[PDB]
Coordinates of C-alpha atoms in Angstrom, one line a residue:
Chain A
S297 CA -14.3 21.9 14.7
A298 CA -14.6 23.1 11.1
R299 CA -12.7 26.4 11.8
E300 CA -9.6 24.5 13.1
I301 CA -9.7 22.3 10.0
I302 CA -10.0 25.2 7.4
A303 CA -7.1 27.0 9.3
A304 CA -4.9 23.9 9.1
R305 CA -5.7 23.5 5.3
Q306 CA -4.8 27.2 4.7
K307 CA -1.4 27.0 6.4
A308 CA -0.4 23.8 4.6
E309 CA -1.6 25.3 1.3
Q310 CA 0.4 28.5 2.0
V311 CA 3.6 26.4 2.5
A312 CA 2.9 24.4 -0.7
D313 CA 2.4 27.6 -2.7
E314 CA 5.6 29.3 -1.3
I315 CA 7.6 26.1 -2.1
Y316 CA 6.1 26.0 -5.7
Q317 CA 6.6 29.8 -6.2
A318 CA 10.2 29.7 -5.0
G319 CA 11.1 26.6 -7.1
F320 CA 12.6 23.3 -5.9
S321 CA 14.6 20.4 -7.3
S322 CA 13.6 17.3 -5.2
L323 CA 11.3 16.8 -2.2
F324 CA 12.7 14.5 0.6
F325 CA 10.3 13.3 3.3
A326 CA 12.7 12.4 6.1
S327 CA 11.7 10.9 9.4
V328 CA 11.9 7.9 11.8
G329 CA 9.6 5.4 13.3
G330 CA 5.8 6.0 13.2
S331 CA 6.2 9.4 11.6
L332 CA 7.3 7.7 8.4
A333 CA 3.9 6.1 7.8
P334 CA 2.1 9.0 6.1
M335 CA 5.3 9.8 4.2
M336 CA 5.5 6.3 2.9
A337 CA 1.9 6.6 1.7
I338 CA 2.8 10.0 0.0
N339 CA 5.7 8.2 -1.8
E340 CA 3.3 5.5 -3.1
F341 CA 0.9 8.2 -4.4
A342 CA 3.9 10.1 -5.9
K343 CA 5.0 6.9 -7.9
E344 CA 1.7 7.1 -9.9
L345 CA 0.8 10.9 -9.8
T346 CA 4.0 13.0 -10.4
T347 CA 7.2 13.2 -12.4
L348 CA 8.6 15.4 -9.6
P349 CA 11.6 13.8 -7.7
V350 CA 9.9 12.6 -4.4
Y351 CA 11.8 10.5 -1.9
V352 CA 11.2 9.0 1.6
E353 CA 14.3 8.5 3.7
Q354 CA 15.1 7.2 7.2
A355 CA 16.5 10.5 8.8
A356 CA 19.4 8.7 10.5
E357 CA 20.5 6.9 7.3
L358 CA 20.1 10.2 5.3
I359 CA 22.4 12.2 7.7
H360 CA 25.1 9.5 7.6
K361 CA 25.0 8.9 3.8
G362 CA 24.0 12.3 2.4
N363 CA 22.4 11.9 -1.1
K364 CA 23.6 13.2 -4.4
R365 CA 20.0 14.2 -5.4
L366 CA 19.7 16.4 -2.2
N367 CA 21.1 19.8 -3.1
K368 CA 20.6 23.5 -2.1
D369 CA 17.3 23.6 -4.2
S370 CA 15.8 20.6 -2.4
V371 CA 13.1 20.8 0.3
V372 CA 13.2 18.4 3.3
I373 CA 9.9 17.7 5.0
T374 CA 9.9 16.5 8.7
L375 CA 7.2 15.5 11.2
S376 CA 7.5 15.2 15.0
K377 CA 4.6 15.5 17.5
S378 CA 6.9 16.7 20.2
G379 CA 9.3 18.6 17.9
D380 CA 12.2 17.1 20.0
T381 CA 12.7 13.7 18.2
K382 CA 16.5 13.6 18.0
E383 CA 16.9 12.3 14.4
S384 CA 14.4 14.7 13.0
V385 CA 16.0 17.7 14.8
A386 CA 19.4 16.4 13.6
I387 CA 18.4 16.2 9.9
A388 CA 16.7 19.7 10.0
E389 CA 19.7 21.3 11.6
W390 CA 22.0 19.5 9.1
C391 CA 19.9 20.9 6.2
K392 CA 19.9 24.4 7.7
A393 CA 23.7 24.3 8.0
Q394 CA 23.8 23.4 4.2
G395 CA 21.2 26.1 3.2
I396 CA 18.6 23.3 2.4
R397 CA 15.0 24.5 3.1
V398 CA 13.0 22.5 5.7
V399 CA 9.3 22.1 6.4
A400 CA 8.4 21.0 9.9
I401 CA 5.0 19.6 11.1
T402 CA 5.0 19.7 14.9
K403 CA 2.6 20.7 17.8
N404 CA 5.1 23.3 19.1
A405 CA 6.5 26.3 17.1
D406 CA 9.4 26.9 19.7
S407 CA 10.5 23.2 19.5
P408 CA 14.0 22.6 18.2
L409 CA 12.6 21.1 15.0
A410 CA 10.3 24.1 14.4
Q411 CA 13.3 26.6 15.1
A412 CA 15.4 24.7 12.4
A413 CA 12.7 24.9 9.8
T414 CA 12.0 27.3 6.9
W415 CA 8.2 26.6 7.1
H416 CA 6.4 25.4 10.3
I417 CA 2.9 23.8 9.9
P418 CA 1.4 23.6 13.4
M419 CA -0.5 20.6 14.9
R420 CA -2.8 21.4 17.9
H421 CA -2.2 19.4 21.2
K422 CA -5.7 17.6 20.8
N423 CA -4.9 16.4 17.2
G424 CA -4.8 12.6 16.6
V425 CA -2.9 10.8 13.9
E426 CA -5.4 11.7 11.1
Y427 CA -4.0 15.3 11.2
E428 CA -0.5 14.0 10.3
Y429 CA -2.0 12.6 7.1
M430 CA -4.3 15.6 6.4
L431 CA -1.5 18.2 6.8
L432 CA 0.9 16.2 4.6
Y433 CA -1.9 15.6 2.1
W434 CA -2.8 19.3 1.8
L435 CA 0.9 20.1 1.5
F436 CA 1.8 17.4 -1.1
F437 CA -1.4 17.5 -3.2
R438 CA -1.3 21.3 -3.4
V439 CA 2.2 21.1 -4.8
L440 CA 0.9 18.6 -7.4
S441 CA -2.1 21.0 -8.1
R442 CA 0.3 23.9 -8.8
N443 CA 2.4 21.5 -11.0
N444 CA -0.7 20.7 -13.1
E445 CA -0.7 17.0 -11.9
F446 CA -3.8 17.1 -9.7
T447 CA -6.7 18.7 -11.5
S448 CA -9.2 17.3 -8.8
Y449 CA -7.3 19.2 -6.0
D450 CA -10.2 21.6 -5.1
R451 CA -12.7 18.8 -4.5
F452 CA -10.1 16.5 -2.9
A453 CA -8.9 19.3 -0.5
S454 CA -12.5 20.3 0.5
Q455 CA -13.6 16.6 1.0
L456 CA -10.5 16.0 3.1
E457 CA -12.1 18.6 5.6
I458 CA -14.9 16.0 6.3
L459 CA -12.6 13.0 6.8
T460 CA -12.5 13.6 10.6
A461 CA -16.4 13.2 10.9
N462 CA -16.2 10.0 8.8
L463 CA -13.3 8.7 11.0
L464 CA -15.3 9.1 14.2
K465 CA -18.1 6.9 12.6
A466 CA -15.6 4.4 11.3
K467 CA -14.0 4.0 14.8
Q468 CA -17.4 3.2 16.3
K469 CA -18.2 0.7 13.5
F470 CA -14.7 -1.0 14.0
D471 CA -15.0 -1.2 17.8
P472 CA -16.6 -4.6 18.0
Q473 CA -14.1 -6.2 15.6
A474 CA -11.2 -4.4 17.4
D475 CA -12.4 -6.0 20.8
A476 CA -12.5 -9.4 19.1
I477 CA -9.0 -9.1 17.6
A478 CA -7.5 -8.0 20.9
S479 CA -9.5 -10.7 22.9
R480 CA -8.2 -13.5 20.7
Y481 CA -4.6 -12.4 20.0
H482 CA -3.4 -10.3 23.0
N483 CA -1.7 -13.5 24.4
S484 CA -0.2 -14.5 20.9
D485 CA 3.4 -15.4 20.8
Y486 CA 3.7 -14.4 17.1
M487 CA 1.4 -12.5 14.6
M488 CA 2.0 -12.1 10.9
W489 CA 1.0 -8.5 9.7
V490 CA 0.5 -8.1 5.9
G491 CA -0.3 -5.2 3.6
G492 CA 1.4 -3.1 1.0
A493 CA 1.9 -0.2 -1.4
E494 CA 0.1 2.9 0.2
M495 CA -1.0 0.7 3.1
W496 CA 2.6 -0.6 4.0
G497 CA 3.3 2.4 6.3
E498 CA 0.2 1.6 8.4
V499 CA 1.2 -2.1 8.7
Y500 CA 4.8 -1.1 9.5
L501 CA 3.7 1.5 12.1
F502 CA 1.1 -0.7 13.9
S503 CA 3.3 -3.7 14.0
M504 CA 6.5 -2.0 15.3
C505 CA 5.5 1.3 17.0
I506 CA 2.3 -0.1 18.8
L507 CA 2.3 -3.9 19.1
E508 CA 6.1 -4.4 19.6
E509 CA 7.1 -1.2 21.3
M510 CA 3.9 -0.5 23.4
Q511 CA 2.6 -4.1 24.0
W512 CA 5.7 -6.3 23.6
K513 CA 3.9 -8.5 21.0
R514 CA 6.2 -10.3 18.5
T515 CA 5.2 -9.6 14.8
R516 CA 6.3 -10.3 11.3
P517 CA 5.3 -7.4 9.1
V518 CA 5.7 -8.3 5.4
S519 CA 4.3 -6.7 2.2
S520 CA 1.4 -8.5 0.3
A521 CA 3.6 -8.8 -2.8
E522 CA 6.6 -10.2 -1.0
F523 CA 4.6 -12.6 1.3
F524 CA 4.6 -15.1 -1.6
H525 CA 8.5 -15.0 -1.8
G526 CA 9.1 -16.9 1.5
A527 CA 7.2 -15.7 4.5
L528 CA 4.1 -17.8 3.3
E529 CA 6.0 -21.0 4.4
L530 CA 5.5 -19.9 8.1
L531 CA 1.7 -19.8 7.8
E532 CA -0.2 -22.8 9.4
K533 CA -3.5 -23.5 11.2
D534 CA -2.7 -21.7 14.4
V535 CA -0.7 -18.7 13.0
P536 CA -2.5 -15.3 13.2
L537 CA -2.4 -13.3 9.9
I538 CA -3.8 -9.8 10.1
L539 CA -4.3 -8.5 6.5
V540 CA -4.7 -4.7 5.9
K541 CA -6.2 -4.1 2.4
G542 CA -5.7 -1.1 0.1
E543 CA -8.3 0.5 -2.2
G544 CA -5.8 1.3 -5.0
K545 CA -4.2 -0.7 -7.8
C546 CA -2.4 -3.2 -5.4
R547 CA -5.7 -4.3 -3.8
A548 CA -5.5 -7.4 -6.1
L549 CA -2.1 -8.3 -4.4
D550 CA -3.8 -8.0 -0.9
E551 CA -6.7 -10.3 -2.1
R552 CA -4.2 -13.0 -3.2
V553 CA -2.9 -13.1 0.4
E554 CA -6.6 -13.3 1.7
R555 CA -7.4 -16.2 -0.6
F556 CA -4.2 -18.2 0.3
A557 CA -4.4 -17.4 4.1
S558 CA -8.2 -18.3 4.3
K559 CA -7.3 -21.9 3.1
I560 CA -4.4 -22.3 5.6
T561 CA -5.0 -20.5 8.9
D562 CA -8.0 -20.5 11.2
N563 CA -6.7 -17.1 12.4
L564 CA -7.1 -14.7 9.4
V565 CA -8.2 -11.1 10.3
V566 CA -9.1 -8.7 7.5
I567 CA -9.0 -4.9 8.1
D568 CA -10.6 -3.5 5.0
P569 CA -11.1 0.3 4.7
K570 CA -13.5 -0.4 1.8
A571 CA -16.0 -1.6 4.5
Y572 CA -16.3 2.0 5.9
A573 CA -18.5 4.7 4.3
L574 CA -16.8 8.1 3.6
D575 CA -20.0 10.2 3.3
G576 CA -19.4 13.3 1.1
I577 CA -16.0 12.0 -0.2
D578 CA -16.0 10.8 -3.9
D579 CA -15.0 7.2 -4.6
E580 CA -12.0 8.4 -6.8
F581 CA -10.3 9.7 -3.5
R582 CA -10.9 6.5 -1.4
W583 CA -7.4 5.0 -2.3
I584 CA -5.8 8.2 -0.9
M585 CA -8.0 8.3 2.2
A586 CA -7.6 4.6 3.0
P587 CA -4.2 4.7 4.8
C588 CA -5.5 7.5 7.0
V589 CA -8.7 5.5 7.7
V590 CA -6.7 2.4 8.7
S591 CA -4.2 4.5 10.7
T592 CA -6.9 6.0 12.9
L593 CA -8.7 2.6 13.4
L594 CA -5.4 0.8 14.4
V595 CA -3.7 3.7 16.4
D596 CA -6.9 4.9 18.2
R597 CA -9.1 1.8 18.6
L598 CA -7.1 -1.4 18.1
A599 CA -4.2 -0.1 20.4
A600 CA -6.7 0.6 23.2
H601 CA -8.4 -2.9 22.9
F602 CA -5.0 -4.7 23.1
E603 CA -4.1 -2.5 26.2
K604 CA -7.5 -3.6 27.9
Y605 CA -6.7 -7.3 27.4
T606 CA -2.9 -7.3 28.1
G607 CA -3.3 -5.0 31.2
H608 CA 0.1 -3.5 29.9
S609 CA -0.2 0.3 29.7
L610 CA 0.8 1.6 26.2
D611 CA 3.0 4.2 28.1
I612 CA 5.3 1.4 29.4
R613 CA 8.9 1.1 28.0
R614 CA 11.4 -1.3 29.4
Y615 CA 14.2 0.6 27.5
Chain B
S187 CA 38.3 -19.5 -13.9
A188 CA 39.7 -16.1 -14.9
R189 CA 38.5 -16.5 -18.5
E190 CA 34.8 -17.0 -17.5
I191 CA 35.1 -13.9 -15.2
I192 CA 36.7 -11.6 -17.9
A193 CA 34.0 -12.7 -20.4
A194 CA 31.2 -12.0 -17.9
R195 CA 32.7 -8.5 -17.2
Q196 CA 33.0 -7.8 -21.0
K197 CA 29.3 -8.7 -21.6
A198 CA 28.0 -6.5 -18.7
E199 CA 30.3 -3.6 -19.8
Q200 CA 29.0 -3.9 -23.4
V201 CA 25.3 -3.6 -22.2
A202 CA 26.2 -0.6 -20.0
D203 CA 28.0 1.1 -23.0
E204 CA 25.1 0.5 -25.4
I205 CA 22.6 1.8 -22.7
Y206 CA 24.8 4.9 -22.1
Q207 CA 25.4 5.4 -25.9
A208 CA 21.6 5.1 -26.8
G209 CA 20.6 7.4 -23.9
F210 CA 18.1 6.8 -21.1
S211 CA 15.8 8.6 -18.6
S212 CA 15.5 6.5 -15.5
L213 CA 16.9 3.1 -14.5
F214 CA 14.4 0.8 -12.7
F215 CA 15.8 -2.4 -11.0
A216 CA 12.6 -4.5 -10.8
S217 CA 12.4 -8.0 -9.2
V218 CA 10.9 -10.1 -6.4
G219 CA 12.2 -12.1 -3.4
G220 CA 15.9 -12.9 -3.1
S221 CA 16.8 -11.4 -6.5
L222 CA 16.0 -7.9 -5.1
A223 CA 19.0 -8.1 -2.6
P224 CA 21.8 -6.9 -5.0
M225 CA 19.4 -4.4 -6.5
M226 CA 18.7 -2.9 -3.1
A227 CA 22.5 -2.6 -2.5
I228 CA 22.9 -0.8 -6.0
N229 CA 20.1 1.6 -4.9
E230 CA 22.0 2.4 -1.6
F231 CA 25.2 3.0 -3.6
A232 CA 23.2 5.1 -6.2
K233 CA 21.9 7.4 -3.3
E234 CA 25.6 8.6 -2.7
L235 CA 27.2 8.2 -6.1
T236 CA 24.8 9.4 -8.9
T237 CA 22.3 12.2 -9.8
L238 CA 20.8 9.6 -12.3
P239 CA 17.2 8.6 -11.6
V240 CA 17.7 5.0 -10.1
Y241 CA 14.9 3.1 -8.5
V242 CA 14.3 -0.4 -7.1
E243 CA 10.8 -1.7 -7.4
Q244 CA 8.9 -4.9 -6.4
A245 CA 8.0 -6.2 -9.9
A246 CA 4.4 -7.1 -8.9
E247 CA 3.7 -3.7 -7.3
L248 CA 5.3 -2.0 -10.4
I249 CA 3.1 -3.8 -13.0
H250 CA -0.1 -3.0 -11.0
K251 CA 0.7 0.7 -10.3
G252 CA 2.8 1.7 -13.2
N253 CA 5.1 4.7 -12.5
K254 CA 5.0 8.3 -13.9
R255 CA 8.9 8.3 -14.0
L256 CA 8.9 5.1 -16.1
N257 CA 8.7 6.2 -19.8
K258 CA 9.8 5.0 -23.3
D259 CA 13.3 6.2 -22.5
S260 CA 13.6 4.1 -19.3
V261 CA 15.6 0.9 -18.9
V262 CA 14.2 -1.9 -16.7
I263 CA 16.8 -4.3 -15.3
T264 CA 15.6 -7.8 -14.2
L265 CA 17.3 -10.9 -12.7
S266 CA 16.0 -14.5 -12.6
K267 CA 18.3 -17.6 -12.2
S268 CA 15.7 -19.8 -14.0
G269 CA 14.5 -16.9 -16.3
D270 CA 10.9 -18.3 -15.6
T271 CA 10.1 -16.3 -12.4
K272 CA 6.5 -15.3 -13.2
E273 CA 6.6 -11.6 -11.9
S274 CA 10.0 -10.9 -13.6
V275 CA 8.7 -12.4 -17.0
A276 CA 5.5 -10.4 -16.5
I277 CA 7.3 -7.0 -16.0
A278 CA 9.7 -7.7 -18.9
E279 CA 6.8 -8.6 -21.3
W280 CA 4.8 -5.5 -20.0
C281 CA 7.8 -3.2 -20.7
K282 CA 8.3 -4.8 -24.2
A283 CA 4.5 -4.2 -25.0
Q284 CA 5.2 -0.4 -24.1
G285 CA 8.5 -0.1 -26.0
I286 CA 10.5 0.1 -22.7
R287 CA 14.0 -1.5 -23.0
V288 CA 14.8 -4.4 -20.7
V289 CA 18.0 -5.9 -19.4
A290 CA 17.8 -9.6 -18.2
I291 CA 20.4 -11.5 -16.2
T292 CA 19.5 -15.2 -16.3
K293 CA 21.3 -18.6 -16.8
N294 CA 19.2 -19.3 -20.0
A295 CA 19.1 -17.2 -23.2
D296 CA 15.9 -19.0 -24.4
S297 CA 14.1 -18.4 -21.1
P298 CA 10.9 -16.3 -21.4
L299 CA 12.6 -13.5 -19.4
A300 CA 15.7 -13.5 -21.9
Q301 CA 13.3 -13.6 -25.0
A302 CA 11.4 -10.5 -23.6
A303 CA 14.7 -8.5 -23.1
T304 CA 16.6 -5.9 -25.2
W305 CA 19.9 -7.1 -23.6
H306 CA 20.6 -10.5 -22.1
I307 CA 23.6 -10.9 -19.7
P308 CA 24.1 -14.7 -19.2
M309 CA 24.9 -16.4 -15.9
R310 CA 26.6 -19.9 -16.1
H311 CA 24.8 -22.9 -14.5
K312 CA 27.7 -23.3 -11.9
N313 CA 27.5 -19.6 -10.9
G314 CA 26.7 -18.9 -7.2
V315 CA 25.1 -15.7 -5.7
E316 CA 28.3 -13.6 -6.0
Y317 CA 27.8 -13.5 -9.8
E318 CA 24.4 -11.8 -9.3
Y319 CA 26.3 -8.9 -7.5
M320 CA 29.3 -9.0 -9.9
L321 CA 27.2 -8.8 -13.1
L322 CA 24.9 -6.0 -11.6
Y323 CA 28.1 -4.2 -10.3
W324 CA 29.9 -4.2 -13.7
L325 CA 26.6 -3.1 -15.4
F326 CA 25.7 -0.2 -12.9
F327 CA 29.3 1.0 -12.2
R328 CA 30.2 1.1 -15.9
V329 CA 27.1 3.3 -16.5
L330 CA 28.4 5.6 -13.7
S331 CA 31.9 5.5 -15.3
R332 CA 30.5 6.6 -18.7
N333 CA 28.5 9.3 -16.8
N334 CA 31.7 10.7 -15.2
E335 CA 30.6 9.7 -11.7
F336 CA 33.0 6.8 -11.0
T337 CA 36.6 7.8 -11.9
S338 CA 37.9 4.6 -10.1
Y339 CA 35.9 2.3 -12.4
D340 CA 39.0 0.7 -14.1
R341 CA 40.6 -0.4 -10.8
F342 CA 37.2 -1.3 -9.2
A343 CA 36.2 -3.4 -12.2
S344 CA 39.6 -5.3 -12.4
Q345 CA 39.6 -5.9 -8.6
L346 CA 36.0 -7.2 -8.8
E347 CA 37.6 -10.1 -10.9
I348 CA 39.5 -11.3 -7.8
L349 CA 36.5 -11.2 -5.4
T350 CA 35.6 -14.9 -6.1
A351 CA 39.1 -16.1 -4.8
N352 CA 38.6 -13.9 -1.7
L353 CA 35.1 -15.3 -1.2
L354 CA 36.3 -18.9 -1.2
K355 CA 38.8 -17.9 1.6
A356 CA 36.2 -16.0 3.5
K357 CA 33.7 -19.0 3.5
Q358 CA 36.5 -21.3 4.9
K359 CA 37.2 -18.7 7.6
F360 CA 33.5 -18.2 8.4
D361 CA 32.7 -22.0 8.6
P362 CA 33.4 -22.5 12.4
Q363 CA 31.2 -19.4 13.3
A364 CA 28.5 -20.6 10.9
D365 CA 28.5 -24.1 12.6
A366 CA 28.2 -22.4 16.0
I367 CA 25.3 -20.1 14.9
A368 CA 23.4 -23.1 13.4
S369 CA 24.2 -25.3 16.4
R370 CA 22.8 -22.8 18.9
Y371 CA 19.8 -21.3 17.0
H372 CA 18.5 -24.1 14.6
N373 CA 15.8 -24.8 17.2
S374 CA 15.0 -21.1 18.0
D375 CA 11.3 -20.1 18.0
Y376 CA 12.2 -16.5 17.1
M377 CA 15.4 -14.7 15.8
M378 CA 15.9 -10.9 15.4
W379 CA 17.9 -10.2 12.2
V380 CA 19.4 -6.6 12.0
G381 CA 21.3 -4.6 9.4
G382 CA 20.8 -1.7 7.1
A383 CA 21.6 0.6 4.2
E384 CA 23.6 -1.4 1.5
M385 CA 23.5 -4.5 3.8
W386 CA 19.6 -4.4 4.2
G387 CA 19.1 -6.6 1.1
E388 CA 21.3 -9.4 2.6
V389 CA 19.4 -9.3 6.0
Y390 CA 16.1 -9.2 4.1
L391 CA 17.1 -12.2 1.7
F392 CA 18.6 -14.4 4.4
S393 CA 15.8 -13.9 6.9
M394 CA 12.8 -14.5 4.4
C395 CA 14.2 -16.5 1.4
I396 CA 16.5 -18.9 3.5
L397 CA 15.5 -19.1 7.2
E398 CA 11.7 -18.6 6.7
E399 CA 11.1 -20.2 3.3
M400 CA 13.8 -23.0 3.4
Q401 CA 14.1 -23.8 7.2
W402 CA 10.6 -22.6 8.6
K403 CA 12.4 -20.4 11.2
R404 CA 10.5 -17.4 12.5
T405 CA 12.5 -14.1 12.1
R406 CA 12.1 -10.4 12.6
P407 CA 14.3 -8.6 10.1
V408 CA 14.5 -4.9 11.0
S409 CA 17.0 -2.1 9.9
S410 CA 19.7 -1.0 12.3
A411 CA 18.3 2.6 12.2
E412 CA 14.7 1.6 12.8
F413 CA 15.5 -1.0 15.5
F414 CA 15.6 1.9 18.0
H415 CA 12.0 3.0 17.0
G416 CA 10.2 0.0 18.6
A417 CA 11.6 -3.4 17.8
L418 CA 14.3 -2.9 20.6
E419 CA 11.5 -3.4 23.2
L420 CA 11.3 -7.1 22.2
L421 CA 15.0 -7.8 23.1
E422 CA 15.7 -9.7 26.3
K423 CA 18.3 -12.2 27.8
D424 CA 17.1 -15.2 25.8
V425 CA 16.3 -13.4 22.4
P426 CA 18.7 -14.1 19.5
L427 CA 19.9 -11.0 17.6
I428 CA 22.0 -11.6 14.5
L429 CA 23.6 -8.2 13.5
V430 CA 25.0 -7.9 10.0
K431 CA 27.4 -4.9 9.8
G432 CA 28.2 -2.7 6.8
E433 CA 31.5 -1.0 5.9
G434 CA 30.0 2.2 4.7
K435 CA 28.7 5.4 6.3
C436 CA 25.9 3.6 8.2
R437 CA 28.4 1.2 10.1
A438 CA 27.9 3.6 13.1
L439 CA 24.2 2.8 13.0
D440 CA 25.0 -1.0 13.1
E441 CA 27.5 -0.4 16.0
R442 CA 24.7 1.3 18.1
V443 CA 22.7 -1.9 17.8
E444 CA 25.8 -4.0 18.8
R445 CA 26.4 -1.9 21.9
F446 CA 22.7 -2.0 23.0
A447 CA 22.2 -5.7 22.3
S448 CA 25.5 -6.7 24.0
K449 CA 24.1 -5.3 27.3
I450 CA 20.6 -7.0 27.0
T451 CA 20.9 -10.4 25.2
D452 CA 23.2 -13.4 25.9
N453 CA 22.4 -14.3 22.2
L454 CA 24.1 -11.6 20.1
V455 CA 25.8 -12.8 16.9
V456 CA 27.8 -10.4 14.8
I457 CA 28.5 -11.0 11.1
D458 CA 31.1 -8.4 10.1
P459 CA 32.5 -8.4 6.6
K460 CA 35.3 -6.2 7.9
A461 CA 36.8 -9.4 9.6
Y462 CA 37.5 -10.8 6.1
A463 CA 40.7 -9.9 4.1
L464 CA 40.0 -8.9 0.4
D465 CA 43.6 -9.5 -0.9
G466 CA 44.3 -7.3 -4.0
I467 CA 41.1 -5.1 -3.5
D468 CA 41.6 -1.5 -2.3
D469 CA 40.0 -0.5 1.0
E470 CA 38.0 2.2 -0.7
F471 CA 35.9 -0.5 -2.5
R472 CA 35.2 -2.6 0.7
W473 CA 31.8 -0.9 1.4
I474 CA 30.7 -2.0 -2.2
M475 CA 32.1 -5.5 -1.9
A476 CA 30.6 -6.0 1.7
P477 CA 27.0 -7.0 0.7
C478 CA 28.4 -9.5 -1.8
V479 CA 30.8 -10.9 0.9
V480 CA 27.9 -11.3 3.4
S481 CA 25.6 -12.8 0.7
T482 CA 28.0 -15.6 -0.2
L483 CA 28.7 -16.3 3.5
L484 CA 25.0 -16.5 4.5
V485 CA 23.5 -18.1 1.3
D486 CA 26.4 -20.6 0.8
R487 CA 27.7 -21.5 4.3
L488 CA 25.2 -20.4 6.9
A489 CA 22.2 -22.0 5.0
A490 CA 24.1 -25.3 4.8
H491 CA 24.9 -25.4 8.6
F492 CA 21.3 -24.7 9.5
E493 CA 20.2 -27.6 7.1
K494 CA 22.7 -29.9 8.9
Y495 CA 21.2 -29.2 12.4
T496 CA 17.5 -29.0 11.4
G497 CA 17.7 -32.1 9.2
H498 CA 15.2 -30.1 7.0
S499 CA 16.3 -30.1 3.3
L500 CA 16.6 -26.6 2.0
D501 CA 14.6 -27.9 -1.1
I502 CA 11.4 -28.6 1.0
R503 CA 8.4 -26.3 0.5
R504 CA 5.1 -27.1 2.2
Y505 CA 3.4 -24.7 -0.2

């Protein structure tokens, strides 16, 4: 519903404004597992769009090492659906103990993560993975807006409100390809998963958090750029390669993988967010939306089609 | 020889001093494939030891995206044994075109990379992988020294001169374990490779640049921290897990992997640099030396033992 979306945008924008108005040194996006994916996209956007110190850190590494750039003026941003994820609670409570301000995105304001946080941005029980991107996008892009580094913010932020409608349509359009991927590869002993830059988080997430953890499928996730520095030698006729393309400046690197793999393997799959219309969203924002498009396609639809063919409930853990 | 080593140290220190004396904004370590490994260790040291802006970037991603933190005051550091590696030459020539100063480490001063560079730090034809670490260490730690962030520099930098002698001894001590690893796993269809923080570059390098590229062995390299966020579900009795331990603050994260894997797989291998004496090097520097120790053990010795058992020359490429 439109009203939920406008409310979500307002809360994220209020956090961004209070952060900007208070002042800050560095922004550290700290998390673990699948929750890193949208943070890794933010980091890739930040490389091009801001001179602000922006970092993404594995929360368990960060609590063991500390960081000389993390100081009492920093803000640490965390995300946990449950708000109980041990490493995220731990880094939030560690920041709090040091007087380092924390943002928490979770679906429960009395979760331990939310109680450790300076700012809580709620997610609603029914919210799928696109909301993790949308809330982090409103937060991060509003900071850039206030810092005079995102002069398209108003239009971007309004158009982000209609991404959910576009994602429903994309998922329906993807469904036949998703069934075909799952049909052919559910019984694969080894899949190569390739993508990079702002798309790397989605390849990372889908490979480890869905296919390995929830379907016990062996994968080799590798970036498009680094594919050509050794992993390419493993490709042959019968090896599956699933390529996730970006719509930013690194699309050319993805296309090099496509051209090489198309000559070598009979088992090339291309997941291209550029194939999906985003009605009412300007083309200049497609490179930002793309990781969110792919995440919803892979986490919602492709996971469900693998589950259908394996017969292995996505809820199963052997550990 | 001692005289080669002292000369190498002097040249790296002179570059560091000229960089520091000229002034700089950010330091970007930009490379591809195996040449990233020592840069990724530097980045992990930098997280704890300096407030200077230090970045490691995949050179092909960096040339496509640019970076808003990369400006005419930055220094870009590159490494290429040949000095011909396309992506490294490309990023150096792109910096030069923009008036961005470049450091090049290569074994040939008339290589294209060396001709694009503001500073050339030579490697000698006979120099193994430890020299990539030692030259980058003298360069980076001398900058930290000049910036009043490394007050042990003198002792560190002198003790680094005796690492080569210690590495020869380590390789001889490792040789029996190396033969046993290669004997058991040369015919493996799938190996998990685990490590992290300052050790991640060595796990990354060995898995993709040696086992995949040069022996066509399928690997899953994954960090110790992130192992527990999905990849762990793939481990079972018959699955090989090679764990590379650190000697820094993330050793505890490596030990969690060890304790879990030891209960589940019959095929746990531990490569622990803490097992090797560094005579005449103070314990406080072991966490810095460790990635260099592991790199020389894996690149020199373990590669050669796999080659012996596979019969597959490390020089072979099918692409």
